[PDB]
Design an enzyme around this catalytic site. Structure first.
Site, PDB file in Angstrom:
ATOM      1  N   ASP A 151     -51.253  17.717 -38.807  1.00  0.00           N
ATOM      2  CA  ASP A 151     -49.977  17.225 -38.309  1.00  0.00           C
ATOM      3  C   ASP A 151     -49.099  18.367 -37.791  1.00  0.00           C
ATOM      4  O   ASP A 151     -48.092  18.750 -38.429  1.00  0.00           O
ATOM      5  CB  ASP A 151     -49.318  16.344 -39.365  1.00  0.00           C
ATOM      6  CG  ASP A 151     -48.102  15.548 -38.898  1.00  0.00           C
ATOM      7  OD1 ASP A 151     -47.867  15.484 -37.675  1.00  0.00           O
ATOM      8  OD2 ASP A 151     -47.314  15.102 -39.772  1.00  0.00           O
ATOM      9  N   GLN A 185     -37.476  10.585 -44.209  1.00  0.00           N
ATOM     10  CA  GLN A 185     -37.522  10.152 -42.817  1.00  0.00           C
ATOM     11  C   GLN A 185     -36.372  10.764 -42.024  1.00  0.00           C
ATOM     12  O   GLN A 185     -35.229  10.765 -42.469  1.00  0.00           O
ATOM     13  CB  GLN A 185     -37.542   8.620 -42.733  1.00  0.00           C
ATOM     14  CG  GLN A 185     -38.884   8.027 -43.170  1.00  0.00           C
ATOM     15  CD  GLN A 185     -38.997   7.800 -44.667  1.00  0.00           C
ATOM     16  OE1 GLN A 185     -37.997   7.773 -45.395  1.00  0.00           O
ATOM     17  NE2 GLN A 185     -40.221   7.610 -45.143  1.00  0.00           N
ATOM     18  N   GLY A 186     -36.718  11.290 -40.848  1.00  0.00           N
ATOM     19  CA  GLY A 186     -35.777  11.975 -39.984  1.00  0.00           C
ATOM     20  C   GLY A 186     -35.789  13.487 -40.199  1.00  0.00           C
ATOM     21  O   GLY A 186     -35.288  14.223 -39.342  1.00  0.00           O
ATOM     22  N   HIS A 193     -46.952  13.833 -35.504  1.00  0.00           N
ATOM     23  CA  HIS A 193     -46.466  12.457 -35.596  1.00  0.00           C
ATOM     24  C   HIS A 193     -45.065  12.256 -34.989  1.00  0.00           C
ATOM     25  O   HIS A 193     -44.624  11.107 -34.834  1.00  0.00           O
ATOM     26  CB  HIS A 193     -46.532  11.931 -37.034  1.00  0.00           C
ATOM     27  CG  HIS A 193     -45.394  12.235 -37.952  1.00  0.00           C
ATOM     28  ND1 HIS A 193     -45.423  13.257 -38.887  1.00  0.00           N
ATOM     29  CD2 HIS A 193     -44.219  11.586 -38.135  1.00  0.00           C
ATOM     30  CE1 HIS A 193     -44.275  13.261 -39.560  1.00  0.00           C
ATOM     31  NE2 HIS A 193     -43.530  12.240 -39.116  1.00  0.00           N
ATOM     32  N   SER A 221     -38.728  14.873 -40.619  1.00  0.00           N
ATOM     33  CA  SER A 221     -40.065  15.076 -40.094  1.00  0.00           C
ATOM     34  C   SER A 221     -40.086  16.133 -39.003  1.00  0.00           C
ATOM     35  O   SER A 221     -39.207  16.117 -38.151  1.00  0.00           O
ATOM     36  CB  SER A 221     -40.557  13.761 -39.526  1.00  0.00           C
ATOM     37  OG  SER A 221     -40.854  12.837 -40.563  1.00  0.00           O
ATOM     38  N   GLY A 222     -41.086  17.018 -39.034  1.00  0.00           N
ATOM     39  CA  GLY A 222     -41.221  18.036 -38.008  1.00  0.00           C
ATOM     40  C   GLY A 222     -40.470  19.327 -38.342  1.00  0.00           C
ATOM     41  O   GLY A 222     -40.740  20.372 -37.748  1.00  0.00           O
ATOM     42  N   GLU A 238     -24.158  25.119 -29.021  1.00  0.00           N
ATOM     43  CA  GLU A 238     -25.416  24.438 -28.758  1.00  0.00           C
ATOM     44  C   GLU A 238     -26.081  24.930 -27.472  1.00  0.00           C
ATOM     45  O   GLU A 238     -25.444  25.370 -26.524  1.00  0.00           O
ATOM     46  CB  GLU A 238     -25.215  22.936 -28.561  1.00  0.00           C
ATOM     47  CG  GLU A 238     -24.685  22.201 -29.789  1.00  0.00           C
ATOM     48  CD  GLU A 238     -23.171  22.107 -29.908  1.00  0.00           C
ATOM     49  OE1 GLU A 238     -22.457  22.833 -29.192  1.00  0.00           O
ATOM     50  OE2 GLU A 238     -22.710  21.339 -30.790  1.00  0.00           O
ATOM     51  N   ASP A 241     -35.930  15.775 -52.438  1.00  0.00           N
ATOM     52  CA  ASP A 241     -37.049  15.711 -51.514  1.00  0.00           C
ATOM     53  C   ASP A 241     -36.573  15.716 -50.066  1.00  0.00           C
ATOM     54  O   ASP A 241     -35.404  15.513 -49.776  1.00  0.00           O
ATOM     55  CB  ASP A 241     -37.808  14.420 -51.776  1.00  0.00           C
ATOM     56  CG  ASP A 241     -39.222  14.286 -51.254  1.00  0.00           C
ATOM     57  OD1 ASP A 241     -39.739  15.257 -50.678  1.00  0.00           O
ATOM     58  OD2 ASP A 241     -39.776  13.164 -51.421  1.00  0.00           O
ATOM     59  N   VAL A 260     -21.250  15.863 -32.545  1.00  0.00           N
ATOM     60  CA  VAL A 260     -20.068  16.519 -32.006  1.00  0.00           C
ATOM     61  C   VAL A 260     -20.539  17.799 -31.312  1.00  0.00           C
ATOM     62  O   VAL A 260     -21.289  18.600 -31.908  1.00  0.00           O
ATOM     63  CB  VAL A 260     -19.051  16.883 -33.118  1.00  0.00           C
ATOM     64  CG1 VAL A 260     -17.869  17.684 -32.586  1.00  0.00           C
ATOM     65  CG2 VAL A 260     -18.559  15.678 -33.914  1.00  0.00           C
ATOM     66  N   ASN A 272     -23.311  19.717 -36.537  1.00  0.00           N
ATOM     67  CA  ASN A 272     -23.054  18.296 -36.406  1.00  0.00           C
ATOM     68  C   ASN A 272     -23.736  17.799 -35.135  1.00  0.00           C
ATOM     69  O   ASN A 272     -23.275  18.153 -34.029  1.00  0.00           O
ATOM     70  CB  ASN A 272     -21.554  18.038 -36.341  1.00  0.00           C
ATOM     71  CG  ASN A 272     -21.205  16.577 -36.537  1.00  0.00           C
ATOM     72  OD1 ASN A 272     -21.852  15.698 -35.965  1.00  0.00           O
ATOM     73  ND2 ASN A 272     -20.228  16.279 -37.386  1.00  0.00           N
ATOM     74  N   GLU A 306     -27.342  23.600 -33.360  1.00  0.00           N
ATOM     75  CA  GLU A 306     -26.684  22.414 -33.848  1.00  0.00           C
ATOM     76  C   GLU A 306     -26.266  22.578 -35.309  1.00  0.00           C
ATOM     77  O   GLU A 306     -27.010  23.129 -36.113  1.00  0.00           O
ATOM     78  CB  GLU A 306     -27.628  21.220 -33.744  1.00  0.00           C
ATOM     79  CG  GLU A 306     -27.756  20.681 -32.322  1.00  0.00           C
ATOM     80  CD  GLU A 306     -26.545  19.863 -31.873  1.00  0.00           C
ATOM     81  OE1 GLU A 306     -25.428  19.933 -32.462  1.00  0.00           O
ATOM     82  OE2 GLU A 306     -26.806  19.081 -30.924  1.00  0.00           O
TER      83      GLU A 306
HETATM   84 CA   LIG Z   1     -23.287  19.571 -32.167  1.00  0.00          CA
END
Ligand SMILES: [Ca+2]
Length: 223
Positions: free
Chosen positions: A84, A174-175, A40, A177-178, A62, A171, A57, A54, A52
């Site tokens: 899914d 949203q965000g 999804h 996900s995955g 990264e 829990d 920033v 932050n 990652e």
């Molecule tokens: Ca960063």
């Protein structure tokens, strides 16, 4: 993540952010060229962000690598969220170090009662809205299939499991996900769905990764 804690920079080295001009979903690095996420979470134009903490920033650890190919599970049903799961191939290999590392696939499925680590950059409020910039973590147990099916009657397949707290308060959301659910050092789930976040008697529902290991291995061996 609702009711969790700040993880600590790069203490979850397999966690990735999927970026399409903005963070939109999480994922898990399973080797130097492949990421696992939720079907999804599909979209065109994904860049994978590794190392990652932050997400707003550039802190210096990264790696930003474009996707070359996305593969949604052949039996994914977007109505029910059965199957899914999606694989993402990176255009070039990541450099693995102490801050960017892969997570093992399971050989057997995890047990009810096992405490797992769930992580992400999703909403931190029940309703209300507040998105963190740094990675959040949550410890949550796998619930019995019996309790899972009681919470979501007629909605749970053999490819899903519930984790969290029937009392509410803690829990994924949203965000997130995955993103990963790691239990005993293996990737056992993918953040998939739930009714609201952190609501009483409505725990998180996760893709059961142990059912997909054959598909994953055969797909990586051929792409
Ligand atoms: Ca960063």
């Amino acid at each position: 993540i609702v009711g969790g804690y700040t993880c600590g920079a790069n203490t979850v080295p397999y966690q990735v952010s999927l970026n399409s001009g903005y963070h939109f979903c999480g994922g898990s690095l399973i080797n130097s060229q492949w990421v696992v996420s939720a079907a999804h979470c599909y979209k065109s134009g994904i860049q994978v962000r590794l190392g990652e903490d932050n997400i707003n920033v550039v802190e210096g650890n990264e790696q930003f690598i474009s996707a070359s190919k996305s593969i949604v599970h052949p039996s994914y049903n977007s109505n029910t969220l059965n199957n899914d799961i999606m694989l993402i191939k990176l255009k070039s290999a990541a450099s693995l170090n102490s801050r960017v590392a892969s997570i093992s696939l399971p050989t057997s499925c995890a047990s009810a009662g096992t405490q797992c680590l769930i992580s992400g950059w999703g909403n931190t409020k029940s309703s209300g809205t507040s998105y963190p910039d740094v990675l959040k973590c949550l410890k949550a147990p796998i619930l019995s299939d019996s309790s899972c099916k009681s919470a979501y009657p007629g909605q749970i397949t053999s490819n899903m499991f519930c984790a969290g707290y029937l009392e509410g308060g803690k829990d994924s959301c949203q965000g997130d996900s995955g993103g990963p659910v790691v239990c005993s050092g293996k990737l056992q789930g993918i953040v998939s769905w739930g009714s609201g976040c952190a609501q009483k008697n409505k725990p998180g529902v996760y893709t059961k990764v142990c059912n997909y290991v054959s598909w994953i291995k055969q797909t990586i061996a051929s792409n």
